[PDB]
Paper text:
Protein gradients play a central role in the spatial organization of cells, but the mechanisms of their formation are incompletely understood. MipZ dynamically interacts with the polar ParB-parS complexes, forming a subcellular gradient with concentration maxima at the tips of the cell and a minimum at the cell center. It inhibits polymerization of the tubulin homolog FtsZ into the so-called Z ring, a structure that forms the basis of the bacterial divison apparatus (Erickson et al., 2010). MipZ belongs to the Mrp/MinD family of P loop ATPases, a heterogeneous group of proteins that act as nucleotide-dependent molecular switches (Leipe et al., 2002).
Superimposition of the structures reveals that MipZ, Soj and MinD share significant similarity in the region constituting the nucleotide-binding site, with an rmsd of 2.4 Å across the 176 α-carbons forming the backbone of the conserved core. However, MipZ differs from its family relatives in the arrangement of several conserved loops. In addition, it displays a number of unique features, including a marked extension of helix 2 and a large loop between helices 9 and 10 (helices 10/11 in Soj). Notably, helices 6 and 7 of MipZ correspond to a single helix in both Soj and MinD (helix 8 in Soj). At the junction of these two helices, MipZ exhibits an unusual structural motif, consisting of a large loop that is stabilized by a short antiparallel β sheet (S6/S7). Together, these distinct characteristics are consistent with a clear evolutionary separation of MipZ from its two relatives. MipZ has no C-terminal amphipathic helix, as used for membrane attachment of MinD, and lacks the conserved DNA-binding domain characteristic of plasmid-encoded ParA proteins (Gerdes et al., 2010). Interaction analyses showed that MipZ monomers bind to ParB irrespective of their nucleotide state. Monomers are unable to interact with the nucleoid and, consequently, display high diffusional mobility, thereby rapidly returning to the polar ParB clusters.
Residue numbers in the entry:
A (entry chain B): 4 to 273, 280 to 287
B (entry chain A): 2 to 146, 152 to 273, 279 to 287
The structure:
């Protein structure tokens, strides 16, 4: 694996939280990692790493940082430019990432856009964060269990389909691995448990993805965001927030998440520096 | 590089699809081509049965009219519908190979939905023909509103284009949606319907041509396996009327939009007028 695309149809589902945690995990494993954020208007992942750089500079602390590549001098402005200019910016950034880094992580916003399609076309691994609800699963398609046939494809699944096509047309013979990461919801109703399980399994089979565990929504992530820090950075020497058992829980979820992506052996580790910081 | 493989399909099977398919077949026959017909609606087989009816009627009479090479996938295609996918695929491949060896045009009537054989038929298409009734609800079969929701039928065509390109065929596949005007259509909706189909055409990658109005005359000809082009003073097991001449004119415009005018028999004593 070198190109990892984190994508879903409508954003959310902790996508950038997952993206930036994958980045720091791979950095701690000793890789050179590039990060490209194709959510040009919101730039959640790119801003996270801008915060990391600023905070580290302010504290004169060193932690691993990625090569963060913008598409232009002003990516918020680029969002309103014609597609061809967004594509050009992406191609130049991607060229630099491939020349300089071992892993390239691309955080992508979904929609019907050239750059999202092109990013998925470069992906060795597509990571799709998905909340555990019926309305969210609709973004992957609709499969009968009237038969188990596809009845309605989704826009996002078409994006992935288009990516696999670009990849093959380009002469890359290795298959792209597509993992939907299911985020469990605190609100999930008992009446829906069996059908939620069965629906996602039916979609996995017909649409062509496999299922892994995501991250539960937690306020701890938004509290870390302004510092550009991930769970893996926290220690007695690095704790601008109180470290709690929430952080240790999140760390375990990330272990299982990374395992499902096939990336365990590339991560930093997961004495215990996080427990030490409690 | 000339059109050889024509795949007629839609999502739900209505919209005069079999009527259109069999009229394309006889037009191309009258134009001097050998034509194969393969019907992948395995349970209903409307087009296959049309040509079985034709054979039976011509045999009963002592009459020669052109007939296609009508190829089944098995000894019992209705039974085949319930068999494992790989058996359907095998039957399709064997039929298609025979058609390609023996015929100039191959017309495949397909039911859509999510089957290997419908995908494979589209993968072999030079021209995809999609009969579609003129309404907002019908157009949803092609997708929705940028694109927000793709449709299964449109994905099947896109998949076909991909298979074609993967096979080393560099010529593009042509895809025409044939818009059947409805008698129920109110005049006030004309522009809204037009704008909707044009937006879908642009994003989904099809072009639009005119279809065939629903008419009782087709149901009346079906038992005899006859199309408009067959009717004459010598061939009229139904009373010929101005409806049949109207249908003939519709077929002309349809065939023209498909790029098939120069291959048709003739959509000189007007034999249809003579039969009135």
């Amino acid at each position: 694996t070198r190109v990892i695309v984190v994508g879903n149809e409508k954003g959310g589902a902790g996508k950038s939280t997952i993206a930036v945690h994958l980045v720091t995990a791979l950095l701690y494993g000793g890789a050179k990692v590039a990060v490209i954020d194709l959510d040009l208007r919101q730039r959640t992942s790119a801003r996270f790493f801008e915060n990391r750089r600023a905070w580290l500079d302010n504290k004169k602390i060193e932690l691993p940082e990625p090569l963060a590549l913008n598409l232009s001098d002003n990516d918020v402005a680029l969002a309103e430019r014609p597609e061809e200019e967004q594509v050009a910016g992406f191609e130049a950034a991607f060229a630099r990432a491939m020349a300089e880094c071992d892993f390239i992580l691309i955080d992508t916003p979904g929609g019907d856009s050239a750059i999202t399609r092109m990013a998925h076309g470069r992906a060795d691994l597509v990571v799709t964060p998905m909340n555990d609800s019926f309305v969210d699963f609709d973004m992957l398609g609709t499969v009968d269990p009237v038969t188990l046939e596809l009845t309605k494809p989704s826009l996002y699944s078409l994006t992935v389909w288009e990516g696999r096509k670009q990849r093959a047309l380009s002469g890359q013979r290795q298959a792209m691995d597509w993992v939907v990461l299911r985020n469990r919801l605190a609100t999930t109703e008992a009446r829906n448990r069996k059908r939620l399980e069965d629906r996602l399994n039916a979609l996995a089979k017909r649409v062509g993805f496999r299922i892994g565990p995501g991250l539960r929504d937690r306020v701890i992530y938004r509290e870390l965001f302004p510092f550009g820090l991930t769970i893996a950075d926290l220690s007695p020497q690095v704790r601008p927030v109180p470290v709690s058992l929430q952080h240790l829980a999140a760390r375990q979820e990330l272990r299982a998440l990374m395992h499902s992506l096939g990336l365990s052996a590339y991560s930093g580790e997961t004495v215990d520096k996080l427990a030490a910081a409690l």
